[PDB]
Amino acid sequence: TGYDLSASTFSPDGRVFQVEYAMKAVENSSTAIGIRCKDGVVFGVEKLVLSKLYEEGSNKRLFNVDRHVGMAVAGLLADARSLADIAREEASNFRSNFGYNIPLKHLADRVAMYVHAYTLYSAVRPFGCSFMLGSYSVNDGAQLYMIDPSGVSYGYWGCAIGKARQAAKTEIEKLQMKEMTCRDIVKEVAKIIYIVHDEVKDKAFELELSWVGELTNGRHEIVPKDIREEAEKYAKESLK
Amino acid sequence: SIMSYNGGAVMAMKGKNCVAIAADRRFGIQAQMVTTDFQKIFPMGDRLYIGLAGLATDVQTVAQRLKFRLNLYELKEGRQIKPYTLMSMVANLLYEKRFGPYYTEPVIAGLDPKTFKPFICSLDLIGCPMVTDDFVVSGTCAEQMYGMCESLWEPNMDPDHLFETISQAMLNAVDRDAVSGMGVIVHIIEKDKITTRTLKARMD
Amino acid sequence: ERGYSFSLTTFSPSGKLVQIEYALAAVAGGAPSVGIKAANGVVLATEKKQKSILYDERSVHKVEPITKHIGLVYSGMGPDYRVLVHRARKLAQQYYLVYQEPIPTAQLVQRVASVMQEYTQSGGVRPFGVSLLICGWNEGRPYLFQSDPSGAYFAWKATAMGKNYVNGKTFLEKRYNEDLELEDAIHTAILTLKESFEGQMTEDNIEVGICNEAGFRRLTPTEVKDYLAAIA
Amino acid sequence: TTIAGVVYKDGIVLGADTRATEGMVVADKNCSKIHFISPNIYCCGAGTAADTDMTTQLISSNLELHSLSTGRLPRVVTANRMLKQMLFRYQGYIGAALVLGGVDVTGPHLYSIYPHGSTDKLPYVTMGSGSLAAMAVFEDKFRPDMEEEEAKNLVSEAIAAGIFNDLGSGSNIDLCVISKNKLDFLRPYTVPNKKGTRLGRYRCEKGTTAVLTEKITPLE
Amino acid sequence: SSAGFDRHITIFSPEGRLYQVEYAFKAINQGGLTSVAVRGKDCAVIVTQKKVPDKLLDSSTVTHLFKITENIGCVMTGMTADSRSQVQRARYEAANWKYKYGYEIPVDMLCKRIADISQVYTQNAEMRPLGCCMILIGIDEEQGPQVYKCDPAGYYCGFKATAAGVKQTESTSFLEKKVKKKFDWTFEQTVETAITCLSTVLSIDFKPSEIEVGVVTVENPKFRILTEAEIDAHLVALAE
Amino acid sequence: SRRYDSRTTIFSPEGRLYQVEYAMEAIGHAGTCLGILANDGVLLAAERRNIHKLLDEVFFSEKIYKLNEDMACSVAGITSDANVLTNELRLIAQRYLLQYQEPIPCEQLVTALCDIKQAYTQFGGKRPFGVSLLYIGWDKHYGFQLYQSDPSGNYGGWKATCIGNNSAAAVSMLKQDYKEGEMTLKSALALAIKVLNKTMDVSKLSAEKVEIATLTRENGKTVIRVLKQKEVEQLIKKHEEEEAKAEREK
């Protein structure tokens, strides 16, 4: 106390509490995980139905930055739509100036510097968001990135954001990841969401799945969700 | 031309230990004189003058802008200004108006503020300095003034014959000019005193 | 920024400026230095201690030239020194672009302190924590000036800043006199530097620059090791 | 105006005349068209006289600022980069024909700079009004890796060719020798032309001029 | 003591101190990392470990060795987000030297540009002073290799062999006993001391995967990051 | 953002100012100056606050700042706060000359500075000037003039004045020993040596501790005179002679 007000003052042991406070504000949100196979990236977001609260299909946290780049946001919601507007704007200037598609390594770096810029001044606050970045390219492969509210950005083969983070990543490493095709992984990601989040906290939940990869010709789109319906059928085989 | 709108002539000449400067007196508009007392030589400190010729607007304008910067220089420092320092000051002031230029051609004459060493120079309308050792001229009737000083100037001259040489140089060159005339004033300065004379010229 | 622009330095109820007094405390805890003007040139001497045996000595410099006849040292904090050096480097050029003539030593101290005084009155910044010593043999007679973070400036025959600056003040009052030579001035400048230094004094413990009428010159560690014979 | 330069086996020799004209009237019999930039780099100017003077002082101010910051010796490619970038920005309204030469760690370097921004690295260049006369001397009598006294013979021959063939040129010949250590600057090198003696005594004594009003002001 | 707002913004204490910058020196130490630089007769060696706590976390996106230009590499300590934003400042002003001045920037002139920028963070009082540290290497013509260090206070000086991170007081106490006893420095003489200084401070005797080695030599002036095979060659070389 | 502001603009709860009164008490310490005219000519008295024997004194000019060919000033307060004001007021007097080609009258030059000094007190929260200073000058309308300046932007016309807190007792002497137009320029000078004898607590009035600068009217020159250190000493020995002469009655 006394040092935790601004984002421009250091603590007398060497850190900044305003960044520390906004990190666990992301922790209070629901679980969004991500994983990549050898020829694609699979997204999965648990979404909570409160009582009715919306027409189903509202405010989906799987955004769409570029034709080959996708989001998976968690934490606060309104600032996540702001970062989506920054990332769509950044990929357009790369297209206009340099004439080809944005690499995911640069797109992570340009956004993370912008997230970093709101951690230095007393006039603005740090963001309360954290998200994922998935892409695919035949000259590059499948890449999966991860950005905290502080601005640290690097890669993963799999990651998880939300309340269930450490409890949700214990079973991610139990899988094989190299030899898998992503269509097998689509029904895999369904059970990790379905194992965690017992209905004691919230009775109603709902699953989204986004999916970019070699089968989707590099373009990013949602899964055929009502089609083929093997998410929920194969997930509810975890009864014992 | 724009330089030939009002006309004029300024001549300076270096002597042995003294320096002399002279100009005409006529103020006119292209055929029609107005008066015979238009000042073109302005004192900048002691034993150091400056002469201006060309468009009479920029004559009265630059002589006040230069006086503006000069009094600030002699109050920030305790000393007076050196003649090389003034030449760099005027060349700065003309080059600032690089594309909207002042239509004037300055002539600086003066002595050392430490010794009796004289100094003469003249500048372009955009500010190229040019130092010599014998004479500098400026104005509309330039070519008549070169014909005098190339045929009358001698290296080591007492202040008497220096006065007689610059007098015959002006009275023969300006009377050949049409738009310049109506009297010639001559300043001859030295280490100990300043002498100012007015000559008897043709008033036609 | 936003446009706050408010000065954080105001008057005391006693009628003093507190932050300027606190900035002078950081100057007094600086490295010791001395400067002596003796009748043909000015001798500046500083006290450069590397904290370890791993540091390089030919990298960081203390006696710093401004023109070919103007040198400048300090006693205060390191990084704030390099700001107003580069400010004074550029400021000497606009005199030379206008007047085509090397700038007098009194003319910088008018202008460098005007940068430094306005910087305290300005909004949202602290003052500097560096005092200076400026030397130069302009127009025969050499000069020796001293500025401070309060914006003021003086003119000393011989003075000292840094640690034990009052002890070397009494030392220079007794040892120095009206006139000397350049070589005698270096001998007593090391003698007041040996007053407050550590045990060993080598070519890297001290660093000395001089002015002549031939121009400003910085001494190499060879001759400083050579002048170290008959030490202090 | 005729300026020229060449690179011999150890350094660079520059040269020019000292005539500055005005219209068709000789305004200056002894001008100075070789300028200081650094202790190893000089520059010769041509074209508008005030545009060459005010440009060559700004770059020499910047390189003094640059080299005193680095604590080292400047490079000729640094001065080339400043001039081609400054003159291109002013779109050729500043008419300044330049010859840039100096000796670096990398050795001697010679450049020619046109008032729009085009630059050329050449072993020998000529600029100015009488540059065509000096270029014919260069191509007829060039050989690589000359000595110093052979090169000083060549430039003073080429500048003299522009003296006796071009109307805008013709005065005393300047030279400069820039080498790895030696710096030589020769404000007279060869006087090709004199002035004839005055035959008639033209002096009338003191009192042959009518004076209307005198005025005396003493000083201190 | 506290007086006015000395504990909060960049103003002077009554003692003459200012606390926010000396709060920033122990802002490096939360990284949990130690970097070592050693300059020899014709070579300069950076060596720094890394910690990879997760199998899901990648391998290529961790390395702090950052190639600034073709002849200048660097290593970063302190917190990650402030370290990376420091790098694109260095990448940008290295390129401006080529455009303004033609020739290649020296390694010493770059640390003047960085420390004068980091001055203004301290110098102005409405901006956060970027608690990360900077270490450069490089080859100069007629000067040999160099090693420099920039600081969040904004001061630089050359070195012969100097570590950074957490364990300066143990490593520099090791190197002072190591350097001054008349050691002739070949290529592998610098490399073997660069591992074994870190291997005695941390007391690990590591696998060849944790550390990274950047090198530059006056036979190949390009900055070069070693491979784990040739890292293993030098590692068993000191294993007699 | 908002808690760091100092609020040097709000009035006092008494209904007066609060920051200017703190500034005006700094003028009374660190400096003591005065000036006296009653006839043709005007003087200025200075005092060396720092008189240490290792200074150069190579400026050959001091607190008397010749700001014009007809005017100068004597300043007391924060030292380099004056150097902003002296360079500014020098240029106001010079841009007047560019506009009219006629020298600046001494009245409206003072009004130009006092509008600048007020402008920091009106708005902004900028720290005000801790500077009071004097004025001497000749004009075409009233001749020799004196003016006092304030940090508040207030001024006034005077004929005998005061700056320092030690010179508050000099006002009691200046009410006792002043005349109405009898300023022979030895009576005005011996009065000024008499004032600084009693007020300045440095005994015997050493010639290096004080300074006197006068302005006399020439034919058209307005000679500004900074008198040297030799004739200070004979003026001190003149005043010491008059003290030994006047004590004979006791």
Side-chain angles (χ1 to χ4, degrees), chain A residues 1-104 106-138 140-198 200 202 204-218 220-240, chain B residues 1-46 48-204, chain C residues 1-15 17-33 35-49 54-57 59-136 140 142-160 162-173 177-181 183-190 192 195-196 199 201-223 226-227 229-230 232, chain D residues 1-8 10-179 181-205 207-213 215-220, chain E residues 1-40 43-50 52-54 56-58 60-141 143-176 178-181 185-191 193-218 220-240, chain F residues 1-11 13-35 37-49 52 54-175 177-182 184-192 194-199 201-203 205-208 210-220 222-227 231-248:
Chain A
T1 63
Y3 297 98
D4 53 352
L5 295 176
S6 176
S8 297
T9 62
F10 283 159
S11 66
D13 58 353
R15 66 183 184 272
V16 176
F17 291 107
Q18 289 289 320
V19 180
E20 295 291 327
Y21 291 162
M23 286 181 181
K24 64 184 176 67
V26 182
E27 184 66 28
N28 298 117
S29 176
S30 67
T31 301
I33 68 170
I35 193 69
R36 62 174 180 175
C37 71
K38 63 182 180 292
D39 54 351
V41 176
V42 176
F43 285 159
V45 172
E46 184 181 4
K47 184 178 177 180
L48 297 171
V49 180
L50 296 175
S51 179
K52 173 186 71 177
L53 267 296
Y54 61 99
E55 279 282 330
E56 183 178 2
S58 177
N59 62 12
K60 299 180 291 295
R61 292 182 291 173
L62 290 167
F63 291 157
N64 198 0
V65 167
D66 202 76
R67 181 66 179 171
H68 66 283
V69 177
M71 297 288 282
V73 301
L76 195 147
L77 186 61
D79 292 332
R81 287 191 291 269
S82 299
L83 286 173
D85 292 330
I86 299 299
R88 291 185 182 95
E89 192 270 336
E90 183 68 28
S92 296
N93 297 120
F94 190 86
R95 183 69 56 83
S96 66
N97 295 318
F98 294 147
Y100 66 99
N101 290 319
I102 177 67
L104 192 61
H106 290 279
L107 187 61
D109 290 331
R110 298 293 295 163
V111 173
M113 292 299 107
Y114 181 75
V115 178
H116 185 206
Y118 288 166
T119 62
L120 299 173
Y121 296 100
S122 65
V124 297
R125 71 169 184 265
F127 283 148
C129 292
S130 180
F131 59 92
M132 303 295 289
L133 287 174
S135 177
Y136 183 76
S137 177
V138 295
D140 295 331
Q143 292 83 17
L144 183 61
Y145 288 154
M146 170 66 193
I147 291 94
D148 57 352
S150 69
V152 179
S153 177
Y154 56 87
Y156 288 100
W157 290 280
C159 181
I161 305 167
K163 293 185 292 294
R165 181 176 179 179
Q166 296 179 357
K169 67 184 181 181
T170 307
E171 68 271 15
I172 296 173
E173 66 184 2
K174 301 285 103 175
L175 296 174
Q176 295 296 320
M177 179 266 301
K178 296 278 99 173
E179 293 86 3
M180 295 295 174
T181 63
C182 278
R183 188 177 64 247
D184 296 331
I185 298 300
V186 169
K187 69 182 180 67
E188 289 294 327
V189 175
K191 76 176 72 172
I192 284 96
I193 303 300
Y194 185 77
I195 283 169
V196 80
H197 183 270
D198 193 3
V200 178
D202 288 326
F205 64 96
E206 196 273 332
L207 179 62
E208 288 87 2
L209 293 173
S210 182
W211 182 55
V212 64
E214 192 271 332
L215 200 151
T216 67
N217 291 319
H220 184 208
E221 71 270 17
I222 200 167
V223 300
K225 178 65 176 66
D226 54 353
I227 307 300
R228 183 266 314 277
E229 209 260 329
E230 288 296 325
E232 292 85 2
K233 297 297 288 184
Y234 182 68
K236 294 188 293 293
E237 295 176 352
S238 67
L239 56 93
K240 67 180 179 67
Chain B
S1 177
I2 301 170
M3 293 294 174
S4 296
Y5 185 79
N6 298 116
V10 175
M11 183 186 288
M13 188 181 291
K14 186 184 288 184
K16 177 70 174 179
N17 304 325
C18 60
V19 68
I21 189 168
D24 55 352
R25 299 291 297 275
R26 182 182 181 271
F27 178 74
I29 301 169
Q30 292 179 353
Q32 177 182 3
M33 65 168 289
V34 176
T35 183
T36 57
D37 54 352
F38 185 75
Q39 181 179 1
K40 295 177 184 177
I41 297 170
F42 295 97
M44 297 297 173
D46 291 332
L48 193 148
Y49 289 170
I50 189 168
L52 294 174
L55 183 62
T57 300
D58 296 333
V59 172
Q60 293 177 355
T61 303
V62 173
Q64 294 176 356
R65 298 290 179 88
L66 184 62
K67 185 68 176 177
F68 181 77
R69 295 179 182 177
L70 183 63
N71 294 119
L72 295 174
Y73 180 75
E74 291 181 353
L75 289 172
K76 291 180 181 179
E77 297 182 356
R79 63 180 181 177
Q80 292 178 355
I81 187 167
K82 292 178 71 67
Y84 290 95
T85 306
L86 186 64
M87 183 183 72
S88 297
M89 184 182 288
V90 176
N92 193 7
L93 193 147
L94 295 176
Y95 187 75
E96 293 175 354
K97 300 294 188 291
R98 176 62 182 85
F99 296 98
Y102 292 107
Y103 293 97
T104 184
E105 291 177 353
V107 171
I108 299 169
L111 295 174
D112 192 5
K114 300 296 186 291
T115 65
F116 59 93
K117 185 178 289 294
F119 180 77
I120 52 171
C121 68
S122 66
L123 283 79
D124 292 333
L125 61 96
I126 53 175
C128 178
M130 182 180 72
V131 293
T132 58
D133 293 331
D134 45 356
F135 62 96
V136 287
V137 295
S138 293
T140 60
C141 56
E143 295 180 355
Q144 293 83 16
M145 293 188 287
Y146 290 114
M148 293 296 107
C149 299
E150 288 290 328
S151 297
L152 293 175
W153 181 75
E154 292 179 355
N156 294 319
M157 295 179 69
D158 54 349
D160 292 331
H161 292 168
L162 185 65
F163 178 73
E164 295 294 327
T165 297
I166 197 166
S167 298
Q168 298 295 319
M170 290 297 289
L171 292 175
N172 291 317
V174 177
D175 287 335
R176 180 61 65 190
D177 194 5
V179 300
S180 296
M182 304 303 290
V184 174
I185 187 167
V186 174
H187 293 283
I188 171 67
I189 65 172
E190 63 183 2
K191 186 70 175 177
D192 293 333
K193 65 181 181 293
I194 292 170
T195 300
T196 296
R197 294 186 182 93
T198 61
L199 298 177
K200 183 180 184 294
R202 293 178 64 87
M203 300 299 287
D204 54 353
Chain C
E1 62 179 0
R2 296 175 294 173
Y4 62 100
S5 297
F6 63 96
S7 295
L8 54 92
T9 301
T10 64
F11 292 103
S12 68
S14 67
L17 294 174
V18 181
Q19 292 293 321
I20 296 172
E21 295 178 354
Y22 289 169
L24 293 174
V27 174
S33 178
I36 294 167
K37 182 259 184 182
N40 53 5
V42 184
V43 176
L44 294 180
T46 187
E47 198 270 333
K48 184 256 183 65
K49 286 179 70 67
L54 296 171
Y55 292 173
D56 195 2
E57 291 85 3
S59 66
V60 176
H61 301 290
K62 297 291 182 68
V63 173
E64 189 67 30
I66 303 300
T67 322
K68 68 183 288 184
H69 67 285
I70 294 167
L72 195 148
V73 298
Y74 72 103
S75 295
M77 60 184 70
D80 285 336
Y81 174 66
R82 292 183 292 111
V83 176
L84 49 89
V85 169
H86 179 74
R87 183 65 59 85
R89 292 281 183 86
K90 291 172 72 174
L91 184 145
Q93 295 296 321
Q94 291 96 25
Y95 190 86
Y96 184 75
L97 290 174
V98 172
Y99 296 98
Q100 297 295 320
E101 194 270 329
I103 180 164
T105 64
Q107 191 57 252
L108 281 82
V109 184
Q110 295 297 112
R111 295 178 184 271
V112 172
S114 69
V115 174
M116 198 170 185
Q117 173 62 41
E118 189 271 333
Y119 188 73
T120 65
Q121 191 178 3
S122 64
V125 291
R126 71 177 186 272
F128 291 101
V130 173
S131 293
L132 298 175
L133 293 173
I134 302 167
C135 61
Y143 295 98
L144 179 61
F145 291 152
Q146 176 181 1
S147 69
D148 56 356
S150 71
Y153 62 96
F154 294 99
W156 294 100
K157 295 183 182 294
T159 186
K163 290 181 182 179
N164 296 115
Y165 68 99
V166 295
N167 299 115
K169 189 67 175 176
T170 62
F171 184 78
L172 290 175
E173 194 273 333
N177 56 0
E178 182 179 2
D179 55 350
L180 290 174
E181 292 294 326
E183 293 85 4
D184 294 333
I186 307 167
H187 186 272
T188 178
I190 300 169
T192 184
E195 182 69 29
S196 298
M201 292 179 70
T202 63
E203 64 185 2
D204 294 332
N205 297 115
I206 51 97
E207 193 264 325
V208 175
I210 59 170
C211 280
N212 291 317
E213 194 65 29
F216 178 72
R217 182 178 176 85
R218 188 179 182 182
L219 296 175
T220 65
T222 298
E223 290 85 5
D226 292 331
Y227 197 82
Chain D
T1 301
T2 301
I3 59 174
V6 75
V7 176
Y8 65 96
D10 293 330
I12 294 169
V13 176
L14 297 174
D17 55 347
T18 57
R19 177 177 284 176
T21 63
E22 182 178 2
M24 301 304 288
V25 178
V26 176
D28 195 0
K29 294 180 182 179
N30 191 0
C31 185
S32 178
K33 295 187 288 294
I34 297 172
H35 296 90
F36 181 81
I37 296 296
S38 73
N40 56 355
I41 300 165
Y42 286 169
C43 182
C44 296
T48 301
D51 286 333
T52 59
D53 288 331
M54 296 302 292
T55 304
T56 195
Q57 292 176 357
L58 182 61
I59 303 298
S60 179
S61 177
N62 291 318
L63 288 175
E64 183 179 2
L65 181 59
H66 179 75
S67 67
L68 190 59
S69 178
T70 63
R72 293 179 183 178
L73 190 68
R75 294 183 182 179
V76 181
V77 297
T78 304
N80 193 7
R81 185 63 61 85
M82 293 180 183
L83 287 170
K84 69 175 75 175
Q85 186 173 358
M86 181 178 175
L87 294 176
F88 181 74
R89 187 180 65 191
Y90 290 100
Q91 297 295 321
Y93 290 105
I94 298 172
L98 295 176
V99 171
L100 187 63
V103 176
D104 291 336
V105 179
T106 63
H109 296 285
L110 185 63
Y111 293 109
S112 68
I113 298 168
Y114 294 98
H116 292 284
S118 65
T119 60
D120 289 326
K121 180 186 284 187
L122 291 177
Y124 60 95
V125 292
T126 65
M127 295 300 290
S129 67
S131 65
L132 301 176
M135 185 59 72
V137 177
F138 278 164
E139 182 64 30
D140 187 74
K141 292 179 182 179
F142 185 76
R143 60 182 296 276
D145 293 331
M146 292 180 286
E147 295 294 325
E148 181 176 359
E149 294 294 326
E150 186 177 1
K152 288 172 69 176
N153 196 5
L154 184 61
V155 176
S156 65
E157 183 179 1
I159 298 299
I163 284 171
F164 293 100
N165 291 314
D166 184 74
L167 290 174
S169 295
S171 287
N172 294 320
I173 297 171
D174 296 335
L175 286 180
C176 177
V177 176
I178 299 171
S179 70
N181 54 1
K182 180 177 70 176
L183 179 62
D184 293 333
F185 186 76
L186 300 173
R187 174 69 67 192
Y189 182 74
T190 299
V191 179
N193 298 115
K194 300 291 181 68
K195 185 177 179 181
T197 63
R198 294 177 65 186
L199 279 75
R201 180 178 291 169
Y202 292 159
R203 177 177 289 172
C204 293
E205 294 293 326
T208 185
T209 301
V211 177
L212 294 176
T213 301
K215 181 67 176 177
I216 303 300
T217 301
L219 294 175
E220 180 67 29
Chain E
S1 296
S2 179
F5 294 101
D6 54 353
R7 300 288 183 180
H8 295 87
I9 59 171
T10 62
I11 61 170
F12 291 102
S13 73
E15 296 179 355
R17 291 179 182 269
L18 54 92
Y19 293 100
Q20 292 293 321
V21 170
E22 66 182 2
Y23 289 163
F25 283 169
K26 57 183 177 293
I28 290 98
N29 291 318
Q30 287 85 17
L33 191 63
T34 299
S35 65
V36 174
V38 170
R39 182 184 68 188
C43 64
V45 174
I46 304 297
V47 56
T48 304
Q49 75 272 14
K50 68 175 176 292
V52 182
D54 194 2
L56 298 173
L57 194 149
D58 289 333
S60 66
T61 62
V62 187
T63 302
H64 295 86
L65 296 180
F66 289 151
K67 183 177 180 180
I68 300 299
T69 321
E70 294 292 328
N71 295 320
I72 295 169
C74 69
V75 72
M76 301 305 290
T77 60
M79 63 186 73
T80 304
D82 289 338
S83 67
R84 290 179 180 174
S85 296
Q86 186 64 256
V87 174
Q88 290 94 24
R89 296 294 295 162
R91 295 182 188 272
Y92 180 70
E93 290 182 351
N96 289 318
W97 187 273
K98 296 295 292 182
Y99 184 72
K100 291 180 181 180
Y101 300 101
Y103 66 99
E104 182 66 27
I105 186 167
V107 63
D108 183 72
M109 291 298 110
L110 196 147
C111 293
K112 292 177 71 175
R113 298 286 187 184
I114 298 298
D116 289 332
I117 291 166
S118 296
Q119 170 59 252
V120 183
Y121 292 93
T122 301
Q123 187 60 256
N124 193 1
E126 290 291 330
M127 60 198 294
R128 184 175 176 271
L130 289 174
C132 66
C133 182
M134 192 77 202
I135 293 95
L136 280 79
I137 47 96
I139 301 299
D140 193 4
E141 293 178 352
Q143 295 294 322
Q146 290 85 23
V147 170
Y148 291 101
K149 186 189 297 297
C150 183
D151 293 329
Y155 70 101
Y156 65 98
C157 57
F159 299 105
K160 296 181 288 294
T162 294
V166 175
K167 303 294 288 182
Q168 298 88 6
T169 62
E170 293 85 5
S171 179
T172 58
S173 65
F174 182 78
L175 293 177
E176 288 178 352
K178 183 64 69 178
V179 170
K180 70 183 176 66
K181 57 179 183 179
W185 296 100
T186 66
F187 181 75
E188 292 85 4
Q189 186 60 255
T190 59
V191 179
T193 58
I195 278 91
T196 54
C197 69
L198 190 146
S199 296
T200 53
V201 170
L202 296 177
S203 68
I204 301 301
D205 294 332
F206 45 79
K207 184 177 182 292
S209 66
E210 286 88 5
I211 60 102
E212 288 84 5
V213 173
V215 75
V216 71
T217 308
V218 192
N220 189 1
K222 300 295 186 291
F223 179 71
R224 182 178 180 270
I225 298 170
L226 271 71
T227 313
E228 189 176 0
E230 64 185 0
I231 286 169
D232 200 5
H234 293 286
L235 187 61
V236 302
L238 58 90
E240 296 90 5
Chain F
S1 178
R2 63 178 293 163
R3 67 185 183 273
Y4 297 99
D5 190 75
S6 65
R7 293 178 180 177
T8 61
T9 310
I10 300 171
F11 293 100
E14 297 179 354
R16 64 179 179 87
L17 289 176
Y18 182 74
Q19 187 60 257
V20 181
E21 296 293 328
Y22 290 165
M24 291 177 70
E25 293 295 324
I27 284 96
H29 297 88
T32 294
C33 294
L34 58 93
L37 66 89
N39 288 116
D40 295 331
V42 59
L43 59 91
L44 288 170
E47 192 271 333
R48 297 289 188 273
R49 178 61 62 191
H52 184 75
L54 291 175
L55 293 171
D56 286 327
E57 289 89 5
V58 298
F59 288 160
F60 292 160
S61 181
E62 208 259 323
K63 188 181 289 293
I64 311 297
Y65 292 108
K66 184 170 73 72
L67 55 94
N68 198 2
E69 289 86 5
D70 293 331
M71 285 179 279
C73 64
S74 299
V75 71
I78 293 97
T79 62
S80 286
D81 204 3
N83 294 115
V84 177
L85 293 176
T86 56
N87 289 318
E88 179 67 30
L89 188 145
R90 186 175 291 168
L91 206 152
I92 298 299
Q94 191 64 40
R95 69 177 71 187
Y96 184 84
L97 184 61
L98 181 64
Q99 188 176 2
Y100 291 161
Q101 294 294 112
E102 193 270 328
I104 175 68
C106 306
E107 294 85 3
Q108 59 183 356
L109 184 64
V110 178
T111 70
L113 186 68
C114 293
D115 293 333
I116 299 169
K117 292 189 287 183
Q118 182 180 0
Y120 288 168
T121 62
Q122 292 180 358
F123 62 96
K126 182 62 69 178
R127 179 182 61 83
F129 295 103
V131 167
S132 297
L133 61 95
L134 294 175
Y135 293 98
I136 50 97
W138 184 76
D139 57 354
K140 291 174 68 67
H141 296 282
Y142 298 96
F144 298 94
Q145 295 176 0
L146 285 171
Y147 294 99
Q148 181 66 256
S149 67
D150 290 330
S152 67
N154 193 1
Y155 67 94
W158 296 86
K159 292 191 288 294
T161 183
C162 162
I163 292 172
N165 197 2
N166 198 4
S167 177
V171 181
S172 66
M173 185 180 288
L174 286 176
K175 293 185 291 293
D177 292 332
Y178 186 64
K179 55 193 174 295
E180 292 296 326
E182 288 87 5
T184 65
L185 270 298
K186 296 181 291 295
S187 66
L189 294 176
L191 191 146
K194 185 175 72 68
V195 172
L196 276 75
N197 195 2
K198 185 176 179 181
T199 58
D201 292 331
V202 176
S203 178
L205 200 147
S206 67
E208 292 86 4
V210 301
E211 192 273 330
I212 295 96
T214 61
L215 182 143
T216 62
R217 179 63 178 164
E218 192 61 28
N219 302 115
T222 312
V223 175
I224 299 170
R225 180 68 178 172
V226 180
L227 50 90
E231 64 271 21
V232 178
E233 297 177 354
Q234 65 184 358
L235 186 62
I236 296 164
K237 295 186 290 292
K238 180 67 173 66
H239 179 73
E240 291 179 353
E241 191 270 331
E242 295 294 326
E243 193 272 332
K245 182 68 176 177
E247 67 185 1
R248 296 292 183 270

